[PDB]
Design a protein around this ligand. Structure first.
Ligand SMILES: CCCCCCCCCCCCCCCCCC(=O)OC[C@H](CO[C@@H]1O[C@H](CO[C@H]2O[C@H](CO)[C@H](O)[C@H](O)[C@H]2O)[C@H](O)[C@H](O)[C@H]1O)OC(=O)CCCCCCCCCCCCCCCCC
Ligand code: CLA
Ligand code: CLA
Ligand code: CLA
Ligand code: CLA
Ligand code: CLA
Ligand code: CLA
Ligand code: CLA
Ligand code: CLA
Ligand SMILES: CC1=C(C/C=C(\C)CCC[C@H](C)CCC[C@H](C)CCCC(C)C)C(=O)c2ccccc2C1=O
Ligand code: SF4
Ligand code: SF4
Lengths: 90, 69, 61, 150, 39, 80, 141, 29, 738
């Protein structure tokens, strides 16, 4: 009934994995193979800063540059004649 | 806010938040590199002053221009 | 040192009573550096009416 | 008998084991989720988490958006595909800083024996998660607008 | 009443017995000489 | 960590050691003062800089000084 | 004279509080306090809560040395007892702290040479132009 | 509409996006 | 054995201690060295716990202090009556309520102040009052001034008696600790005598004086011509004539034939159509029931006979699984700590004063109350405030208990212990919920402002575009108007017209009408709930960690009231419980300020106004629902537009409100000097000034010192509140009167 042990250096402070059960794969034989092979080329961390950044800008610069009333009210532009100012201006 | 209320409140606020994070599951799996701390006194001093001045300037500017125009 | 109860000006510039008057309580006859124990009527910020000074940091006037 | 008790015996650890936290259930459900699993390689976890948020982000940007009163679901589609790719920057950049030399977790289980450390926290760890959050996210977004639209 | 008079000669009491005097004086003078911008 | 110094105007009344919350100061023998003792700061890596020590000093001017310096995990009062 | 041995002894009665240990105790330095309580009497938990002391040797677990010296001064003043206390590291090492030389720091003990002790009046410091072109401060001269 | 369709959203997002990214890594590491 | 215990002549009654300022503490008794002394002696004047450790002496001090308070309050009540008798329009007001403005203050003719005596009616020149006394007086059946004079003289005597009482029960016959601890007896006597016999005897006044005199006045007969209220007693022929059931006397009472008293003891509800106030008959029956309830309630607790509950028993009984030992130990605490009791009592009083404001808002209980918009706005704002303050005070003292009285060794308590053991979860969750609330309330207004600025009204949060309907509230309103039919059959109309229909109006003005609830109301309520949650965050954090935290474990030793513990630990500014109360006051002010603004705009836009050809013109034309959805709408449609009458109040009777308008801004801004700065600057300033004095041999002996950090904060918050509140005060009253 003593929580004070120098040899037991991990139980002491309370670094207990609260719900970290060490169970087997419940994940399927056919499906785990579908999604290992499919998500193995994008795996590497260096490739993400090359793909996600540059292809992500290519996602903004595509759906960003593609200019009419159909989708937004600015590329629509002014569809009426200019209004009169305060100092008799155009 | 930054001028009137000072550190001790905010740090203890943070003090409970930093416990709160560390025994929140799923979120547990994320931890900070840089320990979260309250801004200094001198920091609070500057940050108040800055907000105050910016607000001053911008408010007047909007008034000055909109009224004169 | 100065005679006990004599009115003495302080000449230590970093004192709260600098160029001010105090009375000598007792000058310790030993090898101590600040023997001249002075007591004043008015306190400092730190709620203290008394301090110790050296023989070159007093002048009986 | 007290419903609430000290943490796995120790009363001098910052926590209280309520029937909310520790119980017969909750300890079985949270382990069933992708992230908390210990024995699995770091590829399949990220996909099971990453996909899910692609559907939580998908519903939203359809019905509340600017083109809610009309391209309403095409509008909501790739916008859910976005918070995916930014999370991938956030999670790739989160990873870029932290891990320089070896892992760091509570090594043991509740039983207390020195179990092998997880790859959840490592140099090659968060990479495959950050990849899982991408391939899961981007693909997982597409199926909230192949089912609601197409 | 040595004690009672020392209290009446306390700071907050004197101030008040002084201010009702120099207030009245200025209200009084503004009555019989109303509205001055000279003298 | 913070710097803490004791100057020779110390009387050795011991209030600054007795006041500290983190045990930075101690009393040592000396030959300068009526009390035959002086204050010392051998543990400034544990110093927080809360300035109780200064508030406790009777000397004029104070014979303990705390110069707030480079800040470490202990000096920032962290338990997390 | 010898510093304290570091044995296993039972901590006093406590239902548990949220104020206690966290990630810092696991990957940084946590702190341990030791003393011999005579009877079972209650004490204020410095990280919040009521807690009953037990007879014989009692040890507590804290993550900051203030939480020791708040308690120790609460154990030393109230109950009139005398506790020792020292650090811990996460690889299994210990640092004996207090009382460092058996004697508590307020009353004098031989063999504790003076550190950071300037031997002049403070106004006999030099002006901070005379400490540029360095990595030095205004007091150390 | 040619120029400001490109340069506004790049200055709005793509400049702060990689700035907050590459300055974060400068801070922590 | 509950019994009368007293000490005989504990303190002599000469002026020996008057002449010695700061006698009460050994520290201050030594006299002043510095000017700080002066402040300290006023700061700690009533802080009896730090003076002495003896609970007896403290206990004797506290109520004698309360007899003094009650004396003062009587003298105050005496004041209003006398002026209402001597310097008022009331008789003129008792003859044409609609066309006379209530006034009970006259200015003297000097220094142009004469202009303040405004055209208030009845041939009288003066200041229009908004206290609501004139309606009280009509409700009490007061008909002539003489009566007001006599009530005034009585209050003065009562003031004398209370002052006597307070000297007595300290200097001749001071009760013993035992005494003060008779909680069961105190509770029983206060419930049954004070409240019970109070509302009973009042109900006597109402049934014998109020009800008859009111009917004759509402009939329209000249008040001078109305019979005097004692002749109603000795000639019941007049009472029989007014309500028939008096013929049968007190026989129906004893015989349980109470249904015959349905003449004057009703349950009709709604408003009296001729006066715009609740039926006095409903009120008489209300007080009659309430008296019985309280009377029987006051016989719960055990005293000098076996029968009755013991507080400690009920407390020790109530325990369960999650809490451990539960309520155990609480009795002993709440019989030994004044602070704890003060903490409880302030929370519930405060809550009470706010519910009083609302219930007085929704159910005007006095004649011609509803139609005196000045009075109604004044009373609701007032009572909403004092409540505000009292609630913050509850928090303050709770913390003071937590620091000074809590001792687990001597007076253990587990509920408290368990609360302490998980404080981190509580505060963290409150933090979360508050950020939530802040975003989803303020954020909505910012969103609206942005959409409105960007030309997108169809995307706004509003009845027109976005709908956020208060479905629950509408349900409850639905249930309230249909209740008189189904769930409360004997009730004729609704409790209030703001739920039901039937728009009742008096003198061409709207007394009350159904209040519509839309998106704008959805908004403001959630703002409130945000503000309250933040205030609770600050104050609860303050009380729970008053003793210790992760930063300062030994905070408990440092005190309740103290500035800091230095620049160490990174910096520890505002760690104390006091500082929490400090910041709590600002958020409270914030919350309460939006409530009363909510109230005023709501009332002028959706409720109040004039009644034309089968139709209604509101004061601000129902702009609320469309304007209060954006910050710009408050800025312009409320603040800017409404401030019109205050800003041009010059040259009129209302000019004092313009002066106070500016003065309150002054004092508000003036607070910021104290709040933004620190005494380090000020002390050095003072060094130079002191030089200047010494140079001319005019230095004071009492060494001039800058205020403490704490005093700087106190002065700051005080001037901040006073400025803010006084500005809103000058605003509303000039606005609503003009
Ligand atoms: C652009 C947008 C802004 C983006 C970033 C800035 C935001 C964050 C600023 C807050 C941080 C302030 C701060 O760090 O807080 C503390 C700092 C630094 O304090 C220093 O802190 C130091 C910390 O020491 C540590 O560090 C030292 C080395 O750095 C040594 O190692 C030392 O031993 C170690 O102890 C030392 O203690 C120094 O004595 C002490 O001076 O305070 C200071 O000096 C402040 C720094 C100097 C500012 C210059 C004056 C600014 C006045 C502006 C007036 C308003 C203008 C508005 C114009 C608007 C017009 C439209
Ligand atoms: C919590 C506050 C809040 C709430 C509930 C909303 C809600 C909404 N906003 Mg948003 N908005 C907010 C704050 C908020 N806003 C703020 C603070 C700003 C910055 C000024 C904006 C700026 C903004 C823009 C620019 C637009 C929206 C739009 C929208 C809609 C779609 C958003 C979505 O699906 O994701 C939705 C009704 C979109 C819409 O169509 O409406 C849209 O075009 N909002
Ligand atoms: C302390 C300052 C002060 C001063 C200098 C004066 C001076 C004066 N007062 Mg007094 N007065 C004072 C305070 C003062 N008063 C106060 C405190 C009050 C009541 C609060 C009054 C109430 C008062 C009245 C009611 C009358 C005077 C009158 C007078 C005048 C006396 C005329 C007379 O006796 O023939 C005189 C000029 C008399 C007057 O003006 O005729 C008069 O009847 N005074
Ligand atoms: C500075 C960079 C930037 C850029 C490139 C965009 C670009 C866009 N925003 Mg905006 N937006 C910005 C800043 C920016 N926003 C900011 C800072 C906020 C937060 C206040 C918002 C909040 C916001 C909302 C809530 C919505 C948009 C929407 C949009 C889209 C509107 C036009 C369309 O239909 O396509 C477009 C992709 C709308 C959208 O995607 O649909 C929409 O509903 N934006
Ligand atoms: C808290 C109670 C209270 C308050 C705030 C006031 C306030 C006031 N009273 Mg007073 N008054 C009060 C109680 C109160 N009264 C009582 C208890 C009595 C005796 C029953 C009087 C009898 C009284 C008289 C006779 C007169 C005033 C007057 C005044 C005004 C001028 C004060 C002055 O003379 O200098 C002032 C607004 C004077 C006034 O209205 O002019 C005035 O003539 N009062
Ligand atoms: C130089 C400025 C000046 C002066 C000499 C006076 C003097 C006086 N005023 Mg004041 N008064 C002033 C400015 C001034 N007033 C201003 C600016 C306002 C508007 C805020 C008022 C509003 C005011 C009221 C409402 C009343 C007085 C009253 C009084 C008298 C008694 C006050 C008292 O002691 O209680 C006193 C003669 C009282 C009175 O007439 O009796 C009273 O009731 N004054
Ligand atoms: C029928 C008897 C009776 C009545 C009507 C009251 C009425 C009152 N008591 Mg109570 N009191 C009573 C019996 C009674 N008490 C008994 C038997 C005890 C216990 C022995 C107390 C002990 C008590 C205390 C200690 C205090 C009061 C106080 C008060 C006042 C509270 C404020 C208020 O409502 O006005 C009030 C007048 C307060 C006061 O005097 O002010 C106060 O501090 N009472
Ligand atoms: C009937 C109610 C009541 C009573 C009797 C007290 C009594 C007390 N309060 Mg107070 N307090 C109250 C209401 C009350 N409070 C309210 C409504 C608030 C909210 C503003 C506060 C806020 C408050 C603070 C912030 C402090 C006190 C403090 C004090 C003490 C010193 C007061 C003094 O001498 O000046 C004293 C025990 C002081 C203390 O240290 O105790 C202190 O610092 N009170
Ligand atoms: C418009 C001005 C402004 C703004 C934007 C904020 C914003 C905030 N304040 Mg507030 N605050 C203000 C003025 C303001 N404050 C002022 C003037 C003071 C000085 C009294 C404070 C003192 C203060 C305290 C003491 C606290 C907040 C809190 C908060 C936060 C509430 C949670 C949320 O909405 O997210 C939030 C960041 C609360 C928090 O931490 O959450 C909190 O406890 N504020
Ligand atoms: C100005 C200022 C001061 C200095 C201001 C002081 C000391 C206020 C007190 C001044 C008054 C005028 C002194 C009271 C004098 C007596 C009433 C007697 C006067 C004699 C007759 C005229 C009645 C502080 O002490 C301070 C402290 C902390 C934060 C901010 C500030 C701050 O802003
Ligand atoms: S306080 Fe000043 S004097 Fe007393 S010991 Fe520490 S240093 Fe020497
Ligand atoms: S500063 Fe606070 S901690 Fe650092 S030494 Fe002086 S007292 Fe001990």
């Amino acid at each position: 009934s003593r929580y004070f042990d120098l040899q037991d250096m991990e139980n002491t402070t309370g670094s207990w994995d609260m719900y970290g059960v060490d169970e087997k794969k419940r994940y399927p034989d056919n499906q785990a193979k579908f999604f290992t092979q499919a998500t193995d080329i994008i795996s590497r961390r260096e490739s993400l800063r090359a793909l996600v950044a540059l292809s992500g800008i290519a996602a903004i610069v595509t759906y960003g540059l593609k200019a009419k009333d159909a989708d937004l009210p600015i590329t629509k532009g002014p569809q009426t004649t200019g209004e009169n100012g305060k100092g008799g201006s155009v | 806010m930054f001028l009137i209320s000072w550190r001790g409140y905010w740090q203890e606020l943070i003090e409970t938040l930093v416990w709160a994070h560390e025994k929140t599951p799923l979120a547990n799996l994320v931890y900070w590199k840089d320990k979260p701390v309250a801004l200094s006194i001198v920091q609070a001093r500057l940050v108040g002053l800055a907000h105050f001045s910016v607000g001053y300037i911008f408010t007047y500017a909007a008034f000055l221009i909109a009224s004169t125009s | 040192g100065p005679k006990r109860g004599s009115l003495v000006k302080i000449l230590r510039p970093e004192s709260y009573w600098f160029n001010q008057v105090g009375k000598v309580v007792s000058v310790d006859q030993s090898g101590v550096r600040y023997p001249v124990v002075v007591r004043f009527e008015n306190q400092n910020y730190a709620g203290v009416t008394t301090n110790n000074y050296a023989l070159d940091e007093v002048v009986a006037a | 008998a007290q419903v609430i008790s000290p943490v796995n015996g120790d009363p001098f650890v910052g926590m209280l084991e309520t029937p909310v936290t520790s119980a017969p259930i909750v300890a079985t459900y949270l382990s069933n989720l992708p992230a908390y699993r210990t024995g699995v390689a770091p590829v399949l976890r990220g996909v099971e988490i990453g996909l899910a948020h692609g559907f939580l982000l998908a519903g939203p940007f359809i019905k509340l958006g600017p083109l809610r009163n009309v391209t309403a679901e095409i509008a909501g589609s790739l916008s859910a595909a976005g918070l995916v790719l930014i999370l991938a920057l956030c999670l790739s950049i989160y990873g870029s800083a932290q891990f320089q030399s070896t892992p760091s977790i509570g090594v043991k289980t509740l039983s207390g024996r020195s179990v092998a450390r997880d790859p959840l926290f490592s140099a090659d760890g968060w990479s495959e998660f950050a990849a899982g959050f991408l391939v899961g996210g981007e693909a997982g977004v597409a199926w909230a607008y192949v089912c609601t639209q197409i | 009443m040595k004690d009672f008079t020392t209290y009446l000669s306390t700071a907050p009491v004197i101030a008040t017995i002084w201010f009702t005097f120099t207030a009245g004086l200025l209200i009084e003078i503004n009555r019989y000489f109303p509205d001055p911008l000279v003298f | 960590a913070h710097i803490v110094k004791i100057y020779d105007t110390c009387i050795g009344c011991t209030q600054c050691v007795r006041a500290c919350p983190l045990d930075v100061l101690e009393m040592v023998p000396w030959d300068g003062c009526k009390a035959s003792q002086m204050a010392s700061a051998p543990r400034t890596e544990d110093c927080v800089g809360c300035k109780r020590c200064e508030t406790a000093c009777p000397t004029d001017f104070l014979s303990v000084r705390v110069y707030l310096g480079s800040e470490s995990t202990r000096s920032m009062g962290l338990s997390y | 004279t010898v510093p304290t041995l570091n044995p296993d002894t039972p901590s006093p009665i406590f239902g548990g509080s949220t104020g206690g240990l966290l990630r810092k105790a696991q990957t940084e330095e946590f702190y341990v306090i030791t003393w011999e309580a005579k009877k079972e009497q209650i004490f204020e938990m410095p990280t919040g809560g009521a807690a009953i002391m037990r007879q014989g040797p009692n040890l507590l677990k804290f993550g900051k040395k203030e939480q020791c010296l708040a308690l120790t001064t609460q154990l030393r003043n109230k109950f009139k007892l005398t506790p020792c206390f020292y650090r811990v590291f996460p690889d299994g090492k210990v640092q004996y702290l207090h009382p460092a030389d058996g004697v508590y720091p307020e009353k004098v003990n031989a063999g504790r040479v003076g550190a950071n002790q300037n031997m002049r009046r403070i106004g006999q410091n030099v002006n901070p132009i005379k400490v540029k072109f360095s990595g030095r401060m205004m007091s150390p001269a | 509409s040619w120029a400001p369709s490109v340069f506004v959203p790049l200055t709005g997002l793509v400049l702060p996006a990689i700035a907050m990214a590459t300055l974060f890594v400068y801070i922590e590491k | 054995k509950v019994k009368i215990a007293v000490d005989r002549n504990p303190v002599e009654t000469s002026f020996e201690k008057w002449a010695k300022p700061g006698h009460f503490s050994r520290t201050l008794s030594k006299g002043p060295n510095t000017t700080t002394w002066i402040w300290n002696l006023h700061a700690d004047a009533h802080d009896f716990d730090s003076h002495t450790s003896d609970l007896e002496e403290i206990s004797r001090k506290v109520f004698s202090a309360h007899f003094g308070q009650l004396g003062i309050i009587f003298i105050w009540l005496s004041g209003m009556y006398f002026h209402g008798a001597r310097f008022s329009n009331y008789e003129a007001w008792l003859s044409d309520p609609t066309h006379i403005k209530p006034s009970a203050q006259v200015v003297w003719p000097i220094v142009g102040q004469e202009i303040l005596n405004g055209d208030v009616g009845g041939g009288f020149q003066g200041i229009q009052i908004t206290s609501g006394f004139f309606q009280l007086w009509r409700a009490s059946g007061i008909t002539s001034e003489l009566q007001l004079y006599t009530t005034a003289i009585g209050g003065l005597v009562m003031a004398a008696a209370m002052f006597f009482a307070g000297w007595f029960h300290y200097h001749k016959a001071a009760p013993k600790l035992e005494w003060f601890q008779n909680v069961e007896s105190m509770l029983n006597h206060h419930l049954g005598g004070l409240l019970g016999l109070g509302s009973l005897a009042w109900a006597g006044h109402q049934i014998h004086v109020s009800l008859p005199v009111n009917k004759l006045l509402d009939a329209g007969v000249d008040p001078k011509e109305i019979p005097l209220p004692h002749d109603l007693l000795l000639n019941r022929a007049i009472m029989a004539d007014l309500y028939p059931s008096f013929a049968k006397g007190i026989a129906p009472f004893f015989t349980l034939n109470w249904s015959e008293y349905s003449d004057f003891l009703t349950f009709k509800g709604g408003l009296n159509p001729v006066t715009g106030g609740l039926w006095l008959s409903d009120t008489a029956h209300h007080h009659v029931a309430i008296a019985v309830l309280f009377l029987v309630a006051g016989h719960m607790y055990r005293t000098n006979w076996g029968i009755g509950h013991s507080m400690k028993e009920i407390l020790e009984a109530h325990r369960g699984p999650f809490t451990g030992e539960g309520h155990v130990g609480l009795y002993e605490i709440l019989t030994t700590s004044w602070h704890a009791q003060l903490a409880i009592n302030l929370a519930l009083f405060g809550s009470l004063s706010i519910i009083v404001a609302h219930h007085m808002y929704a159910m005007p209980p006095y004649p011609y109350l509803a139609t005196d918009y000045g009075t109604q706005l004044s009373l609701f704002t007032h009572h909403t405030w004092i409540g505000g303050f009292c609630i913050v005070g509850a928090g303050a003292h709770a913390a003071i208990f937590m620091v000074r009285d809590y001792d687990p060794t001597n007076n253990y308590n587990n509920l408290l212990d368990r609360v302490i053991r998980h404080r981190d979860a509580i505060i963290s969750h409150l933090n979360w919920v508050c950020i939530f609330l802040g975003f989803h309330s303020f954020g909505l207004y910012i969103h609206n402002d942005t959409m409105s600025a960007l030309g997108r009204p169809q995307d706004m949060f509003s009845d027109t575009a976005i709908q956020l309907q208060p479905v629950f509230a509408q349900w409850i309103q639905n249930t309230h108007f249909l209740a008189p039919q189904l769930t409360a059959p004997n009730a004729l109309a609704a409790t209030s017209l703001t739920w039901g229909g039937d728009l009742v109006a008096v003198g061409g003005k709207v007394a009350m009408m159904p209040i519509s609830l839309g998106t704008s109301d959805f908004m403001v309520h959630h703002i409130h709930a945000f503000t309250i949650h933040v205030t609770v965050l600050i104050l609860l954090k303050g009380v729970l960690f008053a003793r210790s935290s992760r930063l300062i474990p030994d905070k408990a030793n440092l005190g309740f009231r103290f500035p800091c513990d230095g620049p160490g630990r990174g910096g520890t500014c505002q760690v104390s419980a006091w500082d929490h109360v400090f910041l709590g006051l600002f958020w409270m002010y914030n919350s309460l300020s939006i409530v009363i603004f909510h109230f005023s705009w709501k009332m002028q836009s959706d409720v109040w106004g004039t009644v034309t050809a089968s139709g209604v013109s509101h004061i601000t034309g129902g702009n609320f629902a469309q304007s209060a959805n954006t910050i710009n709408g408050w800025l312009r449609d409320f603040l800017w537009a409404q401030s019109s009458q205050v800003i041009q109040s010059y040259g009129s009777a209302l000019s004092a409100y313009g002066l106070i308008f500016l003065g309150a801004h002054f004092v508000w801004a003036f607070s910021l000097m104290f709040l933004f700065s620190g005494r380090g600057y000020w002390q050095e300033l003072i060094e130079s000034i002191v030089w200047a004095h010494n140079k001319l041999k005019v230095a004071p002996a009492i060494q001039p010192r800058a205020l403490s950090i704490t005093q700087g904060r106190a002065v700051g918050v005080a001037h901040y509140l006073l400025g803010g509140i006084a500005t809103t005060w000058s605003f509303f009253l000039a606005r609503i009167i003009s």
